[PDB]
Amino acid sequence: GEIATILVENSISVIPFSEAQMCEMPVNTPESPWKVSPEEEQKRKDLRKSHLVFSIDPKGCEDVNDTLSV
RNA sequence: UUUUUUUUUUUUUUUUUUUUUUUUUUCUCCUCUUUUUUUUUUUU
Fold first, then answer.
1. Which residues form the signal peptide?
2. Short-list A49, A55, A44, A46, CA closest to A69
3. Pick from A26, A1, A4: which is nearest to A15 by CA?
């Protein structure tokens, strides 16, 4: 009840989205997951082999932003 | 040696109809105390 009060009072929504707001999703399905279309591999410039990327991140960091490389 | 007569289960069937959830009261009402109101910053 207190958490609900804190939400309602401070103007924050707790409603999951609607069908048309859901349906517009990238399809990360097991029968066909996501993988880069090769014309965009052309158009970009890969570095997954010639350079090292890693990250320290807080405990529980289910979603990383920060990365660097020197 | 004991004849003859004294009715019985109401008659009738071939009449028209153009609405509609509910329904009808109760008054004015003293919110107690460190504050201006804090605020960059970074790790989600």
1. none
2. A55
3. A4
- The answer to whether some atom of strand B lies closer than 7 Å to the beta carbon of A58 is yes
Query: Quick check: helix, strand or coil at residue A49?
Result: coil
The method of structure determination was cryo-EM
- Which CA distances in Å does A5 have to A9, A17, A44, A70? 6, 21, 48, 47
Nucleotides on strand B lying under 7 Å from protein C-beta: 43-44
Q: Is the CB of A63 under 7 A from strand B?
A: yes
Measured CA angle at A69 (ends A44, A35), to 5 deg = 35
